[PDB]
Design an enzyme around this catalytic site. Structure first.
Site, PDB file in Angstrom:
ATOM      1  CG  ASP F  58      -2.355   0.345   0.877  1.00 58.86           C
ATOM      2  OD1 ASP F  58      -2.737   0.181  -0.298  1.00 58.86           O
ATOM      3  OD2 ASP F  58      -3.107   0.766   1.781  1.00 58.86           O
ATOM      4  CB  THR F  91      -2.361   6.560  -0.940  1.00 58.54           C
ATOM      5  OG1 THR F  91      -1.995   5.181  -1.048  1.00 58.54           O
ATOM      6  CG2 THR F  91      -3.690   6.665  -0.225  1.00 58.54           C
ATOM      7  CB  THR F  92       0.851   4.608  -4.844  1.00 58.25           C
ATOM      8  OG1 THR F  92       0.672   3.699  -3.753  1.00 58.25           O
ATOM      9  CG2 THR F  92       2.282   4.517  -5.330  1.00 58.25           C
ATOM     10  CG  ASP F 392      -7.352  -0.044  -0.220  1.00 57.57           C
ATOM     11  OD1 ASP F 392      -7.685   0.586   0.804  1.00 57.57           O
ATOM     12  OD2 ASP F 392      -6.224   0.059  -0.741  1.00 57.57           O
TER      13      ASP F 392
HETATM   14  N1  LIG Z   1      -5.092  -5.007 -14.908  1.00 55.88           N
HETATM   15  C1  LIG Z   1      -4.590  -3.756 -15.020  1.00 55.88           C
HETATM   16  N2  LIG Z   1      -4.058  -3.319 -16.180  1.00 55.88           N
HETATM   17  C2  LIG Z   1      -3.555  -2.080 -16.303  1.00 55.88           C
HETATM   18  N3  LIG Z   1      -3.540  -1.185 -15.304  1.00 55.88           N
HETATM   19  C3  LIG Z   1      -4.044  -1.492 -14.090  1.00 55.88           C
HETATM   20  C4  LIG Z   1      -4.609  -2.826 -13.874  1.00 55.88           C
HETATM   21  N4  LIG Z   1      -5.030  -2.864 -12.599  1.00 55.88           N
HETATM   22  C5  LIG Z   1      -4.757  -1.656 -12.046  1.00 55.88           C
HETATM   23  N5  LIG Z   1      -4.167  -0.843 -12.937  1.00 55.88           N
HETATM   24  C6  LIG Z   1      -3.724   0.549 -12.709  1.00 55.88           C
HETATM   25  O1  LIG Z   1      -2.923   0.667 -11.539  1.00 55.88           O
HETATM   26  C7  LIG Z   1      -3.042   2.014 -11.092  1.00 55.88           C
HETATM   27  C8  LIG Z   1      -2.707   2.138  -9.610  1.00 55.88           C
HETATM   28  O2  LIG Z   1      -3.613   1.470  -8.739  1.00 55.88           O
HETATM   29  P1  LIG Z   1      -3.030   0.785  -7.403  1.00 55.88           P
HETATM   30  O3  LIG Z   1      -1.896  -0.097  -7.859  1.00 55.88           O
HETATM   31  O4  LIG Z   1      -4.179   0.198  -6.620  1.00 55.88           O
HETATM   32  O5  LIG Z   1      -2.404   1.990  -6.534  1.00 55.88           O
HETATM   33  P2  LIG Z   1      -3.137   3.412  -6.378  1.00 55.88           P
HETATM   34  O6  LIG Z   1      -4.591   3.061  -6.541  1.00 55.88           O
HETATM   35  O7  LIG Z   1      -2.763   3.837  -4.983  1.00 55.88           O
HETATM   36  O8  LIG Z   1      -2.567   4.292  -7.458  1.00 55.88           O
HETATM   37  C9  LIG Z   1      -4.441   2.467 -11.463  1.00 55.88           C
HETATM   38  O9  LIG Z   1      -4.367   3.756 -12.065  1.00 55.88           O
HETATM   39  C10 LIG Z   1      -4.905   1.476 -12.501  1.00 55.88           C
HETATM   40  O10 LIG Z   1      -5.188   2.168 -13.714  1.00 55.88           O
HETATM   41 MG   LIG Z   2      -5.811   0.256  -5.154  1.00 57.94          MG
END
Ligand SMILES: Nc1ncnc2c1ncn2[C@@H]1O[C@H](COP(=O)(O)OP(=O)(O)O)[C@@H](O)[C@H]1O
Ligand SMILES: [Mg+2]
Ligand SMILES: Nc1ncnc2c1ncn2[C@@H]1O[C@H](COP(=O)(O)OP(=O)(O)O)[C@@H](O)[C@H]1O
Ligand SMILES: [Mg+2]
Ligand SMILES: [Mg+2]
Lengths: 50, 56, 154, 439, 223, 529, 523
Positions: F58, F91-92, F392
């Site tokens: 996270d 948050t990231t 989440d």
């Molecule tokens: N299967 C996937 N393919 C491409 N991008 C993805 C996929 N799943 C999540 N993402 C991308 O990862 C990004 C970051 O989400 P996450 O890793 O939960 O951290 P945060 O939500 O804190 O930025 C999102 O903007 C989303 O578009």
């Molecule tokens: Mg997330």
């Protein structure tokens, strides 16, 4: 004895003399009543009296 | 205020502590001229001392 | 200084000395008042005020103008209720006279110490022409008693 | 009955860590949890402060709460840390900063929700709990701020269980935190209306006894915990050992607290003086009891000769004869009876325990209710008032979400509380201007 | 400032024995409050108190004051230290506890029945006792300095009471023992509040408020 | 230098030094956080002073658990948490934009440009971006299948592939079961309980409640097939008078009478419950269960045990509400109005023992409005990892229901804003065109980081994406297994609408304030002592 | 062994002391003079507890600084007197004080006694005040669009200047509501009845001013209602719990029937309390202290809603909003102390937390400002800016006067004093002119922060004011060109200017009367 604080109060000569005798007699009957059912051994999880 | 200044200072020489309560007494008895009295007292001593150094 | 609030000058004063205490009744044995009914609370308040009131009426009956109490450290010597009544009767009150100069005071003005209310009569009083407390310029307040009718050798 | 002990902040954790240490070495418990005593007298009431797990293990009934892992890690890694319950440790990640507002509104709010769950799990294991114990200091933010919030939450949850506390009183000569008076005034305001009684202890007399009377020109806090931990044991001692009269904490309240609002005590511990005097002073009953009414054994900055005592209690430990204890007590009661009570005679409560605290020949414990404590609370208020006029450092409190009115609110109670103690003396009732005219 | 000083002194002139006048200075209260320039410091024809009304709901201006001065606290009554309470019949407990809060109520109604609008007290007032002043529409102040009360009682004609008892058993509160002033106003002076008593009729009294750049400068004019 | 002559022990950093410190330190937080973005991110390990272990991925959890002492690392951390408790995800990406936004603004400032000029560029760019986002959102019905995709897209970036298949069904189902009509979703009614046993693939959903405590008397039944539930918070514990009181007797005989009499207040309460039990449960076929929020004396337990009434003591305050909506009783404080109408219903109650600890299950409710999630695993650190991923998932689903719209993700949208922000920059006047240009590159950190963490080339891949969306007007994102352009909506990648709207609002505000700082100074009292 | 007279007390005297104090006063001015004008940048401060204060407020900068020097302590103190008095102008007051103190050392080095300078300074202050009142502009408070421009001209210098159009509405609505005429003719605008609440998150465009109040509490028992349309509310003070007395009570019991009867008497007493409250048929009960579990049982029976442990600061706002008054003893509960001026009661969740709302009042006299935003630090700067606006609006409502801003007034006063000094003969002529010339540090600071020529712009503006009717010309703070203030539309209340000049002059008088320093005498 009562869980709430409890003291013994005496106001005359007779009550002072008859308190100790009364307590012992009550204890004798309670143990004899237990022995009336036929118990041979008593097990307790706490302090015992003399 | 002359009386206020002297009361707030720390003095241990006995010849000076006499003057500190001199100004204090002028405050209670009258309430004004607490600086004039201190000056006069110190000038009387200084001027009298030279008279004593001469054999008087 | 004087405990009274309002009176600072007496003419043709009659001075009396007291060695007892004007307070709630107090026995040497460890005592205590037990309350078990709601009407008893009002009785205690009323009975205390009457007991203090009775004492002051006796003192004023003899013509006393100036009162001198003696210091006590085991029980209170002058309660707030007592001082209120003595004000309304126009009696000058002076409190906390030392125990070691009682002889000198009696010598100077000729009074007689009293230790019981039943013996507070007009024969135990001293007379003075003037009793007043004077205020020095800044040093503090001082009291003077002048014009004794029966002066001692002090 | 069953009791629970809860510690918070810096000072609270340290004393509690030593307290559990000066309990295990009496009752035959060891830093692994087994019982290695051969006397059944120790195990009769062993369950009042302990829980028994399967296999003969015993664990304390304690909750450790702090907003920084540094203190909790010290106790966990240090001695006796393996004994404690694993989940009982509750810790934050950022601390309190000693801003009473931060520990009362911002940080303590999101921690109590998790702590309140733990105390429920401890209270579920007891057939009938009787009360709590709290250990905290009045200077740190967590001790004052979160300590106030914890008590308020406890009262709403638990209707009529007793609330015993062991709080240290700040000595302003040792001012420390520039903003000390703000922390002390607010917590006492809440303590007055939500606890049965509080046992006050000052670091000043804690500093004096070891340094002057005994030795060690430089006594560190480590020794200070031992001295108060000696006092911890005793008020609490009777509870863990049998007696001819069952003295529970509830009857302590009724028999020691005549008035529900004047309920602050100061304790006493006699048998500890210079190491040479520990040997060469003939430690008999009347000289040992003579330390009860001394000016040295006290641990509060309140002169008794300028005060009047309300009620006294005496606890004795050791295997004596019954006569000499009463004989000297009869003597002492009338020896200095001049400076005694005003209207409550014969206050002396006598308690005797056969087994003394481990280490020394003789031991006792004294509790007194003084009218001179107002001398301590007055000084706190006087310093508080001098700062509030300038509004110094006020933004750090008001700016955190608390209304200014609270500072003025808490001041009123302190003047109200002082007036109460002053009323029961009748001696302090004893002018610059020239207005003395007709009427 | 010379005009202010002479006027204040002549406002406290006292007529004394035979023919001696008296001017007891330091009977004029001097108050300091930073803010506007010192040329805007104002003389008060009356008296000024460094206190605020007890509660918010109570009124904050009276146009014709009937001032009553007291020297004792108004809190729930309580038996003295010598008197104890022992209960053997439980049915009497309820009436016992009422009398604690009911004795004080009766005293208040005796005070308010004579027409008192402003109450001043050196002792404290319990939060419950403030409610009776609220409904009756009266102003009350707690924790008043003794020396302040002496001057107001002298100026307004009121009489200081340390108790209610009279030369008989019962307690009374007559109307011949009340002060009178033309106005009582709570004002705002640079973020805090205080109380002004204007045009006392029994005698004249005055007080001075001083203004300056800061506290160090304000203290200098006072000396 | 004008502050040292007053307090020589003061530390200050003036105009250009102040900007250097902030920008160089904000970049530091980005260099370590950029490896978390996307399902290919790397898992970190964290160890405290006690020796604990806490694996995490996270953003917010990492921020507070890394040893850092910096002023400008404190402003960012406080914002990240404020974006966490409200939205629950994102948050990231918050930190990556703030760092990248300060880097671009520093690029033009070093050439001699006043920072206020760039600041006005950000506001103009911010307003335009919020209008573009308003027309890209996709409105749908919020059916179960759509919510599965939104939940899956947020549970896949925080656990391995096989587990996210299990948690997705549980999270979607639990929200639906407690969801009434337009009335908002009220959390605190999804109980999260952890049981340290068995593999972690046995996480399940229980249509009822589980309680972390059970029967205390030995002879209480361990299973009940058809139960009545009584929910009360009255005390069956021995209690004493508020006013002080003591017992005065005269002999042994009277002492016994006073002993028996003092239990009569409590024994009356116990009889009230038993009298009700005989009435409704006339025959020995049904069950009866008592849940109390307070304590129960051993004497009270013995009386209840003789009638086969299962009883629990000192349950938590929240369960006083959850049981009401699950079973259907009434939470009552007194027994002076007890009646059969105030009892609940439950189809199965049994007890489970896990070594030292015990658990009780309330199952088969008629129409539960509250459910529980049961967490199982072999380690303590694994349970915490599952717990955070569950939080989440619920927030992401709930936001998708409260709003009527869902926004495609996978990096597609930021490219779209980047395209539209370029064609608006010729319109504005002055050197503020530089501010707009700086913002456009800031939004391109999300597609770059995603490609970089998968093992592709940043420049080559991003040009391919911008090669599309410029000749074909479809929304195209990044594919994580081929690097090819990909249509976001068709595959099933989704993102909440409130998260993006708040993310753009927060990031611009901080970067605007940070850039206007003249100097960093520490001239006050050193410590609060 | 040693002979001493004063025992370790330092002492300084002579011209070193007079130069020492002035050099200390100027140093404080140099710290703060970068925070003036619409182009002002921010500063961040560090506190002992680890918080960050990112602020632009003049007072806020100084109250986080520790200085030993006696001379500097004076400057810090007059900063907070200005804020507590009129809430605005804590920066221009400091800059003037330094300049008025710095142009005085020129005369001291020319063997001029300080008392000659002091009599000249306070002589120029009176003409300063009279000239200000001459060019005053009367305002009509009934014009809303005019009052919006007053507040806007005082927050264009802060961070909320981006959302200025929203901020003026929030500040104006609140002050217009807390206005309260009461018994007699005492009109007040007290400010403890306008609570400011911060909640992180959302957006700053979600801020609003409620017709009522908000409470961080929730219903005690879940069964109690959470949505009521027109509640009848009562506010209590005491506790609904059987508490002990204080008269040294004890109970002695000698029968079987006394222990249980005593316990039953406590539940009857509570039922006496609950029945009396029900007699007035309310819908919401608010109390200061705890509520027993039994009392909730009776109240939930009668469909009541209760709140526990509300601060005394919040009851006083509720009592003024709804229309009720607080009653301590339920036996004296009447119909005149029941508040029926609400229009809704709602309990929402704001991020895993429960709030209580009382809005849509018929005529509230208390409001609660709700703020949303990025984080605590940003919202902390928002309320500091909002407080200045609400203090600015109040001064207009008590003294409806205006004077031109942007430095126009300073030049107008400077010209008037200079033309008057040439009718003065004597040595006091020189100090009387240097004091007037010291006002021009206000426009000069504005020019330098803009990035313009301070030599060319100021001489053209001084020459401008020499004409007959141009008193309103000032300096534009964003481009750097002399513009009339009628068209630009910058105004500030007359009260702010008067306090700035009065405080500045009197402080310079204080420090010019110094001759020596004594230190370290340990009380
Ligand atoms: N299967 C996937 N393919 C491409 N991008 C993805 C996929 N799943 C999540 N993402 C991308 O990862 C990004 C970051 O989400 P996450 O890793 O939960 O951290 P945060 O939500 O804190 O930025 C999102 O903007 C989303 O578009
Ligand atoms: Mg997330
Ligand atoms: N748009 C503007 N153009 C020129 N001057 C301005 C403008 N807005 C405000 N000012 C000036 O700024 C001065 C001070 O405002 P501010 O920066 O808030 O400092 P303070 O209020 O602390 O003195 C005022 O004298 C006013 O004339
Ligand atoms: Mg003089
Ligand atoms: Mg301004």
């Amino acid at each position: 004895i009562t869980e709430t604080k409890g003291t013994v109060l005496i106001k005359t000569a007779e009550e002072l003399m008859n308190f100790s005798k009364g307590e012992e007699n009550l204890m004798d009957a309670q143990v004899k009543a237990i022995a009336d059912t036929g118990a041979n051994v008593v097990v307790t999880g706490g302090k015992v009296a003399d | 205020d002359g009386a206020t200044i002297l009361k707030l200072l720390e003095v241990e020489h006995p010849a000076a502590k006499v003057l500190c309560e001199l100004a204090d007494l002028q405050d209670k008895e009258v309430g004004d001229g607490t600086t004039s009295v201190v000056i006069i007292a110190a000038e009387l001593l200084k001027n009298a001392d030279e008279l004593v150094k001469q054999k008087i | 200084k004087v405990s009274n609030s309002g009176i600072t000058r007496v003419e043709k004063a009659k001075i009396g000395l007291i060695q007892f205490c004007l307070s709630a009744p107090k026995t040497d044995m460890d005592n205590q008042i037990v309350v078990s009914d709601y009407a008893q609370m009002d009785r205690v308040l009323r009975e205390e005020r009457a007991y203090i009131l009775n004492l002051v009426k006796q003192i004023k009956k003899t013509g006393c103008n100036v009162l001198l109490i003696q210091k006590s450290i085991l029980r209170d010597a002058l309660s707030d209720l007592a001082l209120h009544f003595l004000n309304k009767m126009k009696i000058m009150v002076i409190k906390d006279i030392e125990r070691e100069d009682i002889e000198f005071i009696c010598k100077t003005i000729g009074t007689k110490p009293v230790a019981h209310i039943d013996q507070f009569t007009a024969d135990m009083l001293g007379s003075a022409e003037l009793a007043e407390e004077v205020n020095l310029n800044g040093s503090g307040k001082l009291l003077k008693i002048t014009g004794c009718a029966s002066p001692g050798k002090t | 009955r069953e009791i629970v002990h809860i510690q918070a902040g810096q000072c609270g954790n340290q004393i509690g860590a030593k307290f559990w240490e000066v309990i295990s070495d009496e009752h035959g418990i060891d830093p692994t949890g087994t019982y290695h005593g051969d006397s059944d007298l120790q195990l009769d009431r062993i369950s009042v402060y302990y829980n028994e797990a399967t296999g003969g293990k015993y664990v304390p009934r304690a909750i450790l709460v702090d907003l920084e892992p540094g203190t909790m890690d010290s106790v966990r890694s240090g001695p006796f840390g393996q004994i404690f319950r694993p989940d009982n440790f509750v810790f934050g990640q950022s601390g309190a900063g000693n801003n009473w507002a931060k520990g009362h509104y911002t940080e303590g709010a999101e921690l109590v929700d998790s702590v309140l769950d733990v105390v429920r799990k401890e209270a579920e294991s007891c057939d009938c709990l009787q009360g709590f114990q709290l250990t905290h200091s009045l200077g740190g933010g967590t001790g004052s701020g979160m300590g106030t919030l914890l008590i308020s939450k406890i009262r709403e949850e638990y209707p009529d269980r007793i609330m015993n506390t062991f709080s240290v009183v700040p000595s302003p000569k040792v001012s420390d935190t520039v903003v000390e008076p703000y922390n002390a005034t607010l917590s006492v305001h809440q303590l007055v209306e939500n606890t049965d009684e509080t046992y006050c202890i000052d670091n000043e007399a804690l500093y004096d006894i070891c340094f002057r009377t005994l030795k060690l020109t430089t006594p560190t806090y480590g020794d200070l915990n031992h001295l108060v931990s000696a006092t911890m044991s005793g008020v609490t001692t009777c509870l863990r050992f049998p007696g001819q009269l069952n003295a529970d904490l509830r009857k302590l309240a009724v028999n020691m607290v005549p008035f529900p609002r004047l309920h602050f005590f100061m304790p006493g511990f006699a048998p500890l003086t210079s190491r040479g005097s520990q040997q060469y002073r003939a430690l008999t009953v009347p000289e040992l009891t003579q330390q009860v009414f001394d000016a040295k054994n006290m641990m509060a900055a309140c002169d008794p000769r300028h005060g009047r005592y309300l009620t006294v209690a005496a606890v004795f430990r050791g295997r004596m004869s019954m006569k000499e204890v009463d004989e000297q007590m009869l003597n002492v009661q009338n020896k200095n009876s001049s400076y005694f009570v005003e209207w409550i005679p014969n206050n002396v409560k006598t308690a005797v325990c056969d087994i003394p605290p481990r280490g020394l020949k003789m031991a006792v414990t004294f509790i007194g209710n003084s009218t001179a404590i107002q001398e301590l609370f007055k000084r706190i208020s006087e310093q508080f008032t001098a700062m509030f006029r300038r509004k110094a450092f006020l933004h750090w409190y008001t700016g955190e979400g608390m209304d200014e009115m609270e500072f003025t609110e808490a001041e009123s109670n302190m003047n109200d509380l002082v007036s109460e103690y002053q009323q029961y003396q009748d001696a302090t009732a004893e002018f610059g201007e020239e207005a003395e005219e007709e009427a | 400032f010379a005009n202010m000083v002479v006027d204040a002194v002549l406002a406290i002139k006292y007529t004394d024995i035979r023919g001696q006048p008296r001017y007891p200075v330091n009977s004029v209260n001097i108050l300091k409050a930073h803010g506007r320039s010192q040329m805007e410091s104002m003389l008060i024809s009356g008296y000024a108190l460094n206190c605020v009304v007890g509660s918010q709901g109570m009124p904050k201006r009276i146009v014709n004051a009937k001032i009553a001065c007291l020297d004792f606290s108004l809190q729930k009554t309580k038996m003295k230290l010598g008197v104890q309470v022992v209960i053997t019949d439980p049915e009497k407990l309820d009436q016992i506890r009422q009398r604690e809060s009911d004795i004080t109520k009766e005293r208040i109604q005796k005070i308010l029945a004579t027409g008192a609008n402003v109450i001043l007290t050196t002792g404290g007032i319990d939060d419950m006792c403030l409610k009776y002043f609220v409904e009756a529409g009266a102003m009350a102040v707690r924790r008043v300095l003794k020396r302040d009360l002496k001057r107001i009682a002298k100026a307004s004609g009121a009489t200081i009471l340390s108790t209610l008892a009279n030369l008989e058993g019962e307690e009374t509160f007559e109307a011949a023992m009340l002060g009178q002033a033309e106005e009582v106003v709570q004002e705002r002076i640079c973020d805090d509040e205080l109380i002004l008593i204007k045009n006392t009729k029994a005698r004249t009294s005055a007080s001075i408020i001083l203004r300056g750049a800061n506290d160090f400068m304000c203290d200098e004019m006072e000396r | 230098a004008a502050v040292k002559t007053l307090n020589p022990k003061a530390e200050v950093a003036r105009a250009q030094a102040a900007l250097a410190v902030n920008i160089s330190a904000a970049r530091g937080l980005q260099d370590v956080l950029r490896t978390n973005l996307g399902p290919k991110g790397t898992m970190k390990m964290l160890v405290s002073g006690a020796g604990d272990i806490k694996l995490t991925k996270d953003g917010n959890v990492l921020l507070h658990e890394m040893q850092i002492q910096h002023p400008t690392a404190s402003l960012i951390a406080k914002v990240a948490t404020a974006q966490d408790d409200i939205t629950g995800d994102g948050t990231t990406s918050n930190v990556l934009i703030i760092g990248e936004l300060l880097k671009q603004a520093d690029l033009y400032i070093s050439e001699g440009l006043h920072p206020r000029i760039i600041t006005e560029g950000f506001e103009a760019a911010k307003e335009k971006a919020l209008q573009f986002l308003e027309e890209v959102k996709v409105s749908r019905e919020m059916d179960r299948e759509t919510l599965i995709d939104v939940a899956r897209t947020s549970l896949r970036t925080k656990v391995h592939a096989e587990l996210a298949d299990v948690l997705t069904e549980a999270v979607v189902d639990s929200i639906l079961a407690i969801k009434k009509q337009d009335e908002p979703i009220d959390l605190f009614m999804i109980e999260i309980m952890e049981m340290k046993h068995k593999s972690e693939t046995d996480t399940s959903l229980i249509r009822g409640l589980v309680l972390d405590h059970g029967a205390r008397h030995p002879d209480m039944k361990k299973r009940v097939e058809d139960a009545y539930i009584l929910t009360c918070n009255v005390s069956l514990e021995y209690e004493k008078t508020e006013v002080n009181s003591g017992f005065f007797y005269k002999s042994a005989e009277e002492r016994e009478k006073l002993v028996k009499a003092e239990r009569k207040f409590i024994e009356d309460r116990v009889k009230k419950i038993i009298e009700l039990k005989r009435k409704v449960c006339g025959d020995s076929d049904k069950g009866f269960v008592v849940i109390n929020q307070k304590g129960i004396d051993p004497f009270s337990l013995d009386a209840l045990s003789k009638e086969g009434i299962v009883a629990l003591r000192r349950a938590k305050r929240r369960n006083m509400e959850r049981l009401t909506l699950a079973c259907g009783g009434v939470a009552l404080n007194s027994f002076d109005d007890l009646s059969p109408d105030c009892l609940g219903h439950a189809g199965l109650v049994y007890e489970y023992t896990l070594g030292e600890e015990k658990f009780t299950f309330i199952e088969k409710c008629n129409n539960p409005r509250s459910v529980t999630l049961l967490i199982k695993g072999p380690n303590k650190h694994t349970l915490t990892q599952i717990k955070d991923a569950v939080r989440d998932g619920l927030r992401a689903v709930k936001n998708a229901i409260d709003d009527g719209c869902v926004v495609p993700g996978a990096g597609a949208v930021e490219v779209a804003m980047a395209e539209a922000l370029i064609k608006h920059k010729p319109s504005v006047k002055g050197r503020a065109q530089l501010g707009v240009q700086a913002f456009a590159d800031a939004l391109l950190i999300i597609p770059k980081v995603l490609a970089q963490n998968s093992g592709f080339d940043l420049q080559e891949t991003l040009v391919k994406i911008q090669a599309e969306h410029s000749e074909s007007g479809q929304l195209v994102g990044v594919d994580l297994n081929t690097g090819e352009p990909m249509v976001a909506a068709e595959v099933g990648v989704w993102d909440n609408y409130c998260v993006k709207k708040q993310l753009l609002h927060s990031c611009t505000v901080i970067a605007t304030n940070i850039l206007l700082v003249d100097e960093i100074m520490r001239a006050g009292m050193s410590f609060l002592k | 062994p040693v002979l001493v007279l004063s025992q370790n007390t330092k002492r300084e005297s002579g011209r070193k002391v007079q130069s020492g104090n002035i050099n200390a006063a100027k140093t404080i001015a140099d710290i703060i003079r970068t925070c003036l004008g619409p182009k002002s940048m921010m500063k961040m401060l560090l506190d002992p507890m680890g918080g960050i204060v990112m602020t632009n407020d003049g007072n806020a900068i100084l109250r986080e600084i520790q200085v030993q020097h006696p001379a500097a302590k004076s400057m810090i103190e007059i900063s907070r007197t200005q804020d507590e008095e009129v809430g605005d102008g804590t920066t221009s007051v400091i800059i003037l004080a330094g300049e008025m103190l710095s142009v005085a050392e020129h005369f001291l080095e020319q063997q001029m006694h300080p008392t000659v300078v002091i009599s000249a300074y306070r002589k120029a202050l009176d003409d300063m005040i009279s000239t200000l009142k001459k060019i005053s502009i009367p305002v009509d408070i009934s014009d809303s669009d005019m009052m919006l421009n007053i507040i806007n001209s005082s927050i264009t210098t802060k961070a909320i200047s981006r959302w200025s159009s929203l901020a003026c509405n929030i500040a104006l609505d609140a002050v217009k509501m807390v206005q309260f005429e009461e018994n007699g003719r005492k009109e007040i605008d007290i400010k403890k009845y306008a609570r400011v609440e911060k909640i992180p998150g959302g957006i700053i465009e979600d801020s609003c001013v409620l017709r009522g109040v908000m409470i961080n509490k929730d219903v005690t028992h879940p069964r109690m209602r959470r949505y009521i349309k027109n509640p009848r509310i009562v506010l209590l003070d005491s506790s609904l719990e059987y508490k002990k007395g204080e008269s040294q009570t004890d109970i002695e019991i000698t029968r079987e029937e006394d222990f249980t009867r005593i316990l039953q008497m406590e539940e009857e007493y509570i039922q006496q309390l609950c029945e009396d409250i029900i007699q007035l048929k309310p819908d919401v009960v608010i109390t200061e202290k705890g509520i027993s579990d039994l009392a909730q049982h009776y109240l939930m029976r009668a469909n009541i809603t209760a709140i526990r442990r509300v601060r005394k600061t919040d009851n006083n706002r509720i009592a003024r909003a709804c229309g009720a008054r607080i009653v301590s003893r339920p036996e004296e509960l009447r119909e005149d102390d029941v508040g029926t001026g609400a229009g809704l009661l709602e309990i929402k969740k704001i991020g895993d937390e429960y709030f209580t709302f009382i809005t849509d009042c018929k005529d509230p006299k208390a409001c609660t400002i709700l703020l949303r935003g990025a984080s605590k630090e940003i919202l902390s700067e928002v309320e500091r800016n909002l407080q200045d606006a609400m203090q600015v609006c109040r001064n207009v409502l008590l003294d409806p006067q205006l004077v031109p801003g942007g430095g126009a007034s300073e030049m107008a006063v400077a010209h008037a004093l200079t033309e008057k000094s040439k009718a003065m003969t004597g040595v006091e002529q020189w100090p009387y002119r240097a004091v007037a010339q010291a006002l021009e540090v206000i426009p000069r600071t504005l020019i330098q922060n803009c990035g313009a020529s301070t030599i060319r712009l100021l001489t053209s503006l001084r020459a401008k004011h020499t004409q007959e009717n141009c008193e309103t010309w000032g300096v534009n703070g964003e481009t750097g060109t002399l513009v009339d203030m009628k068209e630009l539309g910058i105004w500030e209340p007359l009260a702010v200017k008067l306090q700035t000049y009065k405080t500045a002059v009197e402080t310079a008088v204080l420090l010019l009367r110094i001759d020596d320093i004594v230190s370290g005498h340990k009380k």
